Enzyme design. Structure first.
Site, PDB file in Angstrom:
ATOM      1  N   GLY B  14       0.793  -1.209   0.000  1.00  0.00           N
ATOM      2  CA  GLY B  14       0.000   0.000   0.000  1.00  0.00           C
ATOM      3  C   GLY B  14       0.830   1.266   0.000  1.00  0.00           C
ATOM      4  O   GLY B  14       2.046   1.256   0.190  1.00  0.00           O
ATOM      5  N   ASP B 231     -12.547  13.387  11.057  1.00  0.00           N
ATOM      6  CA  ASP B 231     -11.172  13.447  10.575  1.00  0.00           C
ATOM      7  C   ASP B 231     -10.232  14.036  11.622  1.00  0.00           C
ATOM      8  O   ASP B 231      -9.162  13.479  11.889  1.00  0.00           O
ATOM      9  CB  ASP B 231     -11.107  14.255   9.279  1.00  0.00           C
ATOM     10  CG  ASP B 231      -9.907  13.892   8.425  1.00  0.00           C
ATOM     11  OD1 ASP B 231      -9.812  12.723   7.996  1.00  0.00           O
ATOM     12  OD2 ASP B 231      -9.059  14.775   8.182  1.00  0.00           O
ATOM     13  N   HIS B 236      -7.619  14.539  17.135  1.00  0.00           N
ATOM     14  CA  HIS B 236      -6.545  15.490  17.425  1.00  0.00           C
ATOM     15  C   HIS B 236      -6.962  16.490  18.499  1.00  0.00           C
ATOM     16  O   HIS B 236      -6.315  16.609  19.548  1.00  0.00           O
ATOM     17  CB  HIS B 236      -6.140  16.232  16.149  1.00  0.00           C
ATOM     18  CG  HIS B 236      -5.522  15.358  15.104  1.00  0.00           C
ATOM     19  ND1 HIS B 236      -5.557  15.670  13.762  1.00  0.00           N
ATOM     20  CD2 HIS B 236      -4.852  14.186  15.201  1.00  0.00           C
ATOM     21  CE1 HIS B 236      -4.938  14.726  13.077  1.00  0.00           C
ATOM     22  NE2 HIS B 236      -4.500  13.815  13.926  1.00  0.00           N
TER      23      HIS B 236
HETATM   24  N1  NAP Z   1      -0.571   7.378   4.051  1.00  0.00           N
HETATM   25  C1  NAP Z   1      -1.867   7.081   4.102  1.00  0.00           C
HETATM   26  O1  NAP Z   1      -2.532   6.901   3.097  1.00  0.00           O
HETATM   27  C2  NAP Z   1      -2.518   6.968   5.444  1.00  0.00           C
HETATM   28  C3  NAP Z   1      -2.399   7.999   6.358  1.00  0.00           C
HETATM   29  C4  NAP Z   1      -3.010   7.867   7.594  1.00  0.00           C
HETATM   30  C5  NAP Z   1      -3.720   6.711   7.881  1.00  0.00           C
HETATM   31  N2  NAP Z   1      -3.817   5.733   6.977  1.00  0.00           N
HETATM   32  C6  NAP Z   1      -4.575   4.537   7.312  1.00  0.00           C
HETATM   33  O2  NAP Z   1      -3.743   3.382   7.245  1.00  0.00           O
HETATM   34  C7  NAP Z   1      -4.379   2.335   6.516  1.00  0.00           C
HETATM   35  C8  NAP Z   1      -3.501   1.922   5.345  1.00  0.00           C
HETATM   36  O3  NAP Z   1      -4.133   2.347   4.143  1.00  0.00           O
HETATM   37  P1  NAP Z   1      -3.295   2.702   2.822  1.00  0.00           P
HETATM   38  O4  NAP Z   1      -3.053   4.188   2.785  1.00  0.00           O
HETATM   39  O5  NAP Z   1      -2.118   1.769   2.736  1.00  0.00           O
HETATM   40  O6  NAP Z   1      -4.369   2.313   1.690  1.00  0.00           O
HETATM   41  P2  NAP Z   1      -4.096   1.178   0.586  1.00  0.00           P
HETATM   42  O7  NAP Z   1      -2.751   1.447  -0.034  1.00  0.00           O
HETATM   43  O8  NAP Z   1      -5.311   1.083  -0.298  1.00  0.00           O
HETATM   44  O9  NAP Z   1      -4.014  -0.190   1.429  1.00  0.00           O
HETATM   45  C9  NAP Z   1      -2.770  -0.863   1.583  1.00  0.00           C
HETATM   46  C10 NAP Z   1      -2.834  -2.284   1.040  1.00  0.00           C
HETATM   47  O10 NAP Z   1      -3.970  -2.988   1.550  1.00  0.00           O
HETATM   48  C11 NAP Z   1      -4.435  -3.929   0.585  1.00  0.00           C
HETATM   49  N3  NAP Z   1      -5.866  -3.672   0.330  1.00  0.00           N
HETATM   50  C12 NAP Z   1      -6.369  -2.548  -0.199  1.00  0.00           C
HETATM   51  N4  NAP Z   1      -7.718  -2.613  -0.293  1.00  0.00           N
HETATM   52  C13 NAP Z   1      -8.098  -3.802   0.195  1.00  0.00           C
HETATM   53  C14 NAP Z   1      -9.382  -4.512   0.387  1.00  0.00           C
HETATM   54  N5  NAP Z   1     -10.560  -3.946   0.032  1.00  0.00           N
HETATM   55  N6  NAP Z   1      -9.338  -5.744   0.930  1.00  0.00           N
HETATM   56  C15 NAP Z   1      -8.176  -6.315   1.285  1.00  0.00           C
HETATM   57  N7  NAP Z   1      -6.981  -5.729   1.136  1.00  0.00           N
HETATM   58  C16 NAP Z   1      -6.874  -4.495   0.606  1.00  0.00           C
HETATM   59  C17 NAP Z   1      -3.620  -3.695  -0.665  1.00  0.00           C
HETATM   60  O11 NAP Z   1      -2.606  -4.679  -0.769  1.00  0.00           O
HETATM   61  P3  NAP Z   1      -2.818  -5.998  -1.656  1.00  0.00           P
HETATM   62  O12 NAP Z   1      -3.536  -5.486  -2.881  1.00  0.00           O
HETATM   63  O13 NAP Z   1      -1.416  -6.480  -1.904  1.00  0.00           O
HETATM   64  O14 NAP Z   1      -3.636  -6.914  -0.787  1.00  0.00           O
HETATM   65  C18 NAP Z   1      -2.978  -2.351  -0.467  1.00  0.00           C
HETATM   66  O15 NAP Z   1      -1.717  -2.282  -1.130  1.00  0.00           O
HETATM   67  C19 NAP Z   1      -5.718   2.865   6.042  1.00  0.00           C
HETATM   68  O16 NAP Z   1      -6.775   2.257   6.777  1.00  0.00           O
HETATM   69  C20 NAP Z   1      -5.682   4.350   6.298  1.00  0.00           C
HETATM   70  O17 NAP Z   1      -6.922   4.822   6.819  1.00  0.00           O
HETATM   71  C21 NAP Z   1      -3.241   5.834   5.776  1.00  0.00           C
END
Ligand code: NAP
Ligand code: NAP
Ligand code: NAP
EC number: 1.1.1.49
Lengths: 476, 476, 476, 476
Positions: B14, B231, B236
């Site tokens: 991700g 959010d 926060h």
């Molecule tokens: N930097 C940020 O974006 C950020 C910031 C603050 C908080 N967060 C939180 O941290 C978490 C990580 O999210 P992210 O930003 O990494 O989003 P993401 O890239 O869509 O999710 C990371 C990985 O999870 C897997 N995935 C995605 N959708 C899925 C589904 N429907 N079912 C099963 N697996 C799935 C995918 O890997 P595969 O395809 O290899 O399975 C994807 O590469 C989120 O819940 C987000 O709210 C993120």
């Protein structure tokens, strides 16, 4: 419509007149701060003229070429009357000359007594006999010393009060006109943040400092008859204590403020010798020039003198706000620096959760040099663990003090002048100690010119509750 | 002797992983902050290799030529396991691969869950089923969102708590790791000067601010389902409120601090709509570039959206310290500046003697940008009369927040992580308001991109007791 | 060695003399409280003898058969001098008769002025001309009224001060001698438990009550020219307010205490009519006897009189301790009871945890009747649930007030006597209201003889912050 | 609709059952305080019948002729089951008999464990195995001793917690049910007058007293294994300390109150021997009857016993409210009176103006006998001079404690029961001292039966800051 004023300088031939009073009145006239109809009348035994006063004062006038027309307009209103300080004919001539001035009968008369106190009784008595205005007000400016102990000061004050009302007497103290000293009241009483902690429940000790880096510098004989206590402690540090410790006045009227000051003074017991450290500076062999001469190295100082050039005394204000809080008064000459300062050291935080790493908070009000207000407090160390480190909140950011004091006499504001009851309370606090010192002749603790003074002073401060740490590091 | 650790990144393909987690672990390894025996194991459905992760993360690695040897030593300890999030065979392979590592059976297992919450239940259940270490500890890092209301968050928290102890769950909030936010406890509890005034008798109002100068910037559809309250406000500003309002903890142990935080939260009643101002930003026609597009101008935002990009709510802490003191929480996007700030406005000084010229004291703790602590107070105006003027005492004066939070998970410190009871109290405070907003769909007040937000927010702040003056002038 | 004293009663033929002054001096002589060499000299225009004074005063002397020898020894030291109040020859004869007494030249002279104020100027001026002792002290006792407004009282006070020092003037107020009134200072300043709560942070309102159950009872014409405000509020309730509100004096010396009292008075603004409720009692048709006659039913009261027999005013002490705390002064005649009382109602407890069942704490200091101090507070109801109920802590447990006041004049204690500055502050507080009342002739609110007074007074008390509940039940 | 309840008394053949539990349940049934469907089931090894329990308990039943019908209705719901405490068949029969009762499957089961702690593990384990209701709740009442030190109590608590939740465990302490002890919270937190002074700035010391006038009275051997500290100090006086010192709870819910209590306990350091005075009573030769026998005169007491029958310890609560305030815990047997009391001695008034005549204020909360709340304070002496004298404000003015505690178990209120963390904090405070006493066998200071105990206790109280005067005179 604006009234006319006569500034009578008696003793105008003296050093104080030419070096401070005439230049100060000149600067007040230059900026148009004086009333428009202001006449300066000198009075002394020496036979001088306005030209002589100009010649001896212009080096101190700071007179630049631009305002030479205003300069010669200033001495146009200047005049001199020669006479004796106890000759009624001389005072009659002075009164006639004042009446000979334009609107001299309804003018406000401001008598500045730039004379040694030995003639104060005669001068005040004769002024009240013959030179008092019948229409305008009459105010006298009196310079220190105001006696040497309770009895002599009481005699002089009773004599002056027998002729003049308290609203007519202006005992001038140049420190009450300094900016930080006057800012003390605004800092204490205009701010919520300093209100609830300004008490014995939060303050461990109060330190009032007056340091000079120079010694008696030649005129040690004049200092010998008074000493550091009478010179500095009895007036400067005590006024500082009153401002720090006083209750909130009913208003900013002078009477209410001085009422609060005398109320604080009345709650102070007489000083005991065990709470006093005395020192007398000696020469510095490694010093350069004037620092190599000790207090006794002055030829004008009588041999075997035990006069103290340093003093550290602890006072207590026995009232509801301050009971048990030591007030450390520290003053001395030929020290390591010039500094006038108010320091409040606060108690430890109750129920420490940072494993004894916290330091006592401090509030510092530096009157001089480089006026500053800062509070030393604890902040998180930039890092990883939960360790506080010492930091500080710094306060960030015109006529001088003597000019503003003279202006205050002109406007009739008496808040920055010593009241009679305040003077008597100050003298009663220190008189037993002064008599003990004059009687027993205790040897002062020697300290080297340019040091912080006797180490016994630091021991006394530590004993009464102040804790110095030395771990506070500050960089500009 | 030091134990070995396995950093399991699940969802390593991700954006969050490659952009924040892998670089953060890289920086921790570069400075030798991690334990020496630390193995990073990725886990996701996409079939990648360590080379692919390196390729997609090195632009964010900030990898300079000097430490390329350490870079290739870092990926030497890196590994990847492909598998599904609900397939038991994949978790068996993950456990076997972890055991196939050197000392993989007694290693401490740290599971960072970089996944959308939709799979959290399955991932946690399977981790507890098969991938739990029998010797070392097992801690999971959970990212927001933690539900969307009280009910869904309660479901997720109950499911996770059914498998893991509170000492194993680390709900990561990047703001709890910021320097000023952590300095709040030292400022409040290591200093005498801030103790006796930190109460309702002296504080008129508390303002907690979180402003962003940018809008949803393309990904408005993801923001649409949550809104500004969920959010920013729910985590926060509420953590900020807990730190500002909490009683002094028994110690600096994480449990005592979080106990105090939840104790504060339990004293807060549910928010009423009359104490809420909602706004949604519109485009700026005079703006330049991205500022010209409104919230609804985003194609990913559903048409007719009433999602609020701004919120100003007033909370009350109904306890002995804070009763009647309004806590104003103010956050919004596309505003005039970036700012996170704590402001305490103090009451007027009782018994004013300066003829209403005094302004309310203020203590400002600016978390970002340019961390600062300053207190606005009254000082004497340099001049002649007795007029106070506003001045201020300014505080004068390493791994970043995410790095220190991950280090805290390594050392087992939980004070900067949301406890379950704290989460439930936070959700119960805001859930009735969130349900009302989702049900009635009130129209948010439009405000132009780059402004301070709706004027109704200023009206609400003025109504609950905050008084803005605009007379305070500050120059660097 | 003890000095001799002359008690000069001027106006000895009056009702006040025979009914209060001669019996009081008799009782002081009976118990040996007076100085051994005390001579009582009457002075009035009527030609009487010591036998006549004995005959008219013995019914009030409470003279029992046992001490008839002491009675005839008392009148042995008694004497009378007939003369006019503005005839210099009469004062010369008075001085000669005083000198004709044993040791009459070095005796201390105590002049009780039992005369209407119309002759006070002449009496004091002549006493200062001719009857002043040159060796002993000279103190004059002055009775109310002390003027009728600021201007006339200032006239009389300036005239008396032009001849006598403040240490010689004793303005007698019989309430300052009552036991509870003097116990106020000990209660406030000798106890830790009443210290930290005696401020605006804890006190919601202060109620000062002076109720009489009888009307003007025949001499309504004398009351008509003054009214209830001048009669009771301006002196009794204002002294009560000063004692309740004053800061802690530097000592128990009279000067410090009266300084604190005047400091409190100076912080009070002039009364506004919207904070004033006036009433005038009417007859009670269901009343029995004297209660059936109204204020206007008195033949001596001018018809159409708008004189108020009841008043409820709210004052504010604008200082640090009391800012915003209403001081309710309530006095009236022909009310339902006799009562002089100080009530402090405290604020609600902050952060109530007993579901709004708690009542405000109250501290009651009942001066009369049946002196009591009790604090109304909350205690657990004996039962099963966690419900507080109102309860109270009750305080459990000689010359009278006038006798002790006269003794105070003998010993020179001035703490229970009105100082000149205190008098002028009291008059300046009420003078605008008094002028408005006499100018506009507002109709007072009728209330029935024997009731609690106008209901508008209760409305005013409720409006300024006092909350009456009626749920407090007390049984002896 | 009201649920049915089963009161299971295990150990019903014991003295505690017949003398306290059966009579208490009888009185609760008599007044209709129990739920209507309440069945009492005994369980013990001895083979008795309901007739035997009636015969052995009716002398303690206080059964009067009037309610004999209700008496025989009460044992109609009574039953007995014989069995062993570690035989699974006996617990199966107990469960079957409970199910054989009307609505015995959905009934709420309340297990009172009236057994020596030696069988507690087995009884609780078997109850959790077989006798737990699947529909209603299950609560167990556990009696003291709760271990003998930190380790044994921790073992027992861990065993019980491994089977039961904290909401199911009721560790009964009969003192937490007494009226004054429960009134402490209302007194502290429902009243403004006790709020601002309840801190270290105003309180000099806190004294908690538990005195008994009788010795071990025959059963000295049972007392010998525990001693006065474990008997009284570790539970009664420590609960009293928690109630006195605790912060205001978020609400009156049991969890918040016990959270505050454990928060107080966590701020207490382990007791040091220099702050401990131990005594052991000896016989009184001038005593009459049982007072002539000493502690060692009991044949059941092992010879050479050093068990303390008296203890005076000083504790400190190291937090913001209480830092530096000594908490004196004083308990002993065979003393001069019966008394349980809380005394707060306040600091001297700061800035005394009554020439050191003032005495420290005291607040006394006497739990027993003759429940009273009074505050000792200073009032003006009826007289002439300004002298304060000591006086006091006195507070003026159903099921007993055990009945209300059992009712609380019925209603599920746990505020008056010891929580596990509270128990562990209590044991950790005293365990080092207990181990030192058991190891070194220090000889207790003898004191005569019927005295106030060792004089060293008074010396310790004086040393830590309490000042006894003896000048306070009180008459009923
Ligand atoms: N930097 C940020 O974006 C950020 C910031 C603050 C908080 N967060 C939180 O941290 C978490 C990580 O999210 P992210 O930003 O990494 O989003 P993401 O890239 O869509 O999710 C990371 C990985 O999870 C897997 N995935 C995605 N959708 C899925 C589904 N429907 N079912 C099963 N697996 C799935 C995918 O890997 P595969 O395809 O290899 O399975 C994807 O590469 C989120 O819940 C987000 O709210 C993120
Ligand atoms: N018990 C009270 O009545 C009482 C209570 C509280 C306060 N006071 C105050 O104490 C003062 C004493 O008054 P009082 O009650 O004694 O009234 P009073 O009896 O009328 O006056 C006392 C004496 O003063 C002389 N006198 C009366 N009117 C005079 C006048 N117009 N000019 C000159 N002399 C006059 C009379 O003596 P000769 O005829 O012999 O000259 C009279 O016997 C009053 O000002 C009153 O306000 C009195
Ligand atoms: N009133 C009081 O005495 C009192 C006061 C305060 C606290 N407590 C506490 O409450 C608990 C109840 O004790 P108690 O006063 O009832 O003492 P107890 O009468 O000796 O014990 C009650 C019953 O327990 C059974 N029992 C006694 N010793 C046993 C052993 N070694 N193993 C197994 N079962 C045994 C006996 O019944 P069976 O022979 O039928 O099995 C006995 O009738 C005690 O732990 C005590 O500390 C008691």
């Amino acid at each position: 419509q604006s009234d006319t004023h006569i500034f009578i300088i008696m003793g105008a031939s003296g050093d104080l007149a030419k070096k401070k009073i005439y230049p100060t009145i000149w600067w007040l006239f230059r900026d148009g701060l004086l009333p428009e109809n202001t006449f300066i009348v000198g009075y002394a035994r020496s036979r001088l003229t306005v030209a002589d006063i100009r010649k001896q004062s212009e080096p101190f006038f700071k007179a630049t070429p631009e305002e030479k027309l205003k300069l010669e307009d200033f001495f146009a209103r200047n005049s001199y009357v020669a006479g004796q300080y106890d000759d009624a004919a001389s005072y009659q001539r002075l009164n006639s000359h004042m009446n000979a001035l334009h609107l001299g009968s309804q003018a406000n008369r401001l008598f500045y007594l730039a004379l040694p106190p030995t003639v104060y009784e005669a001068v005040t008595k004769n002024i009240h006999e013959s030179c008092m205005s019948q229409i305008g007000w009459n105010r006298i400016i009196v310079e220190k010393p105001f006696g040497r102990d309770l009895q002599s000061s009481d005699r002089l004050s009773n004599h002056i009060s027998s002729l003049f009302r308290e609203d007519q007497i202006y005992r001038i103290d140049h420190y009450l006109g300094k900016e930080m000293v006057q800012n003390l009241m605004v800092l204490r009483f205009a701010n919520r943040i300093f209100g609830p902690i300004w008490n014995r429940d939060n303050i461990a000790c109060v330190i009032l400092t007056f340091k000079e880096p120079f010694g008696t510098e030649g005129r040690g004989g004049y200092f010998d008859e008074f000493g550091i206590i009478r010179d500095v402690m009895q007036n400067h540090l005590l006024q500082m204590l009153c401002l720090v410790a006083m209750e909130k006045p009913a208003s900013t009227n002078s009477d209410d403020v001085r009422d609060e000051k005398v109320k604080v003074l009345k709650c102070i017991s007489e000083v005991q010798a065990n709470n006093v450290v005395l020192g007398q500076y000696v020469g510095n062999p490694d010093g350069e020039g004037e620092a190599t001469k000790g207090y006794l190295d002055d030829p004008t100082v009588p041999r075997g003198s035990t006069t103290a050039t340093f003093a550290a005394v602890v006072l207590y204000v026995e009232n509801e706000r301050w009971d048990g809080v030591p007030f450390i008064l520290r003053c001395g000459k030929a020290l390591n620096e010039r500094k006038a300062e108010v320091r409040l050291q606060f108690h430890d935080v109750a129920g420490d959760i940072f494993h004894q790493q916290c330091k006592r908070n401090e509030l510092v009000i530096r009157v001089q040099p480089n006026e500053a207000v800062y509070t030393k407090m604890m902040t998180k160390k930039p890092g990883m663990f939960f360790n506080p480190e010492e930091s500080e909140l710094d306060l960030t950011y015109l006529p001088d003090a003597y000019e503003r004091l003279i202006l205050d006499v002109f406007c009739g504001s008496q808040m920055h002048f010593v009241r009679s009851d305040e003077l008597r309370e100050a003298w009663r606090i220190f008189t037993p100690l002064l008599h003990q010192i004059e009687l027993e002749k205790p040897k002062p603790i020697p300290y080297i010119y340019g040091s912080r003074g006797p180490t016994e002073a630091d021991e006394l401060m530590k004993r009464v509750g102040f804790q110095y740490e030395g771990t506070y590091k500050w960089v500009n």
